[PDB]
Amino acid sequence: GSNPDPQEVQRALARILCALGELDKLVKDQANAGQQEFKLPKDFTGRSKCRSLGRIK
């Protein structure tokens, strides 16, 4: 159909830390399918407020 928008993708970029396995589907169809959407880097998503919440033991 058509790539997403910089409004939904942008908020999804930093969500890569909260999703963990889900956002990988976007980063692939975004950074390799047309990253012209947003203007923010991929490294910026190195830290977020939503920890992995996986290794909490």
Side-chain angles (χ1 to χ4, degrees):
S2 75
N3 264 293
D5 343 295
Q7 313 188 342
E8 52 174 85
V9 183
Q10 177 148 325
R11 292 285 178 281
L13 258 167
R15 278 271 159 185
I16 300 163
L17 278 178
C18 197
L20 262 51
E22 300 317 314
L23 219 295
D24 285 19
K25 241 162 221 194
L26 163 147
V27 69
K28 207 142 276 180
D29 301 351
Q30 177 60 225
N32 324 321
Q35 212 147 223
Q36 278 199 282
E37 269 47 282
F38 55 70
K39 309 165 157 201
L40 272 159
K42 284 162 75 279
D43 219 45
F44 170 86
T45 74
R47 54 150 76 164
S48 87
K49 180 157 283 154
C50 178
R51 211 64 164 162
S52 41
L53 298 151
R55 302 285 294 195
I56 54 163
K57 209 153 74 195

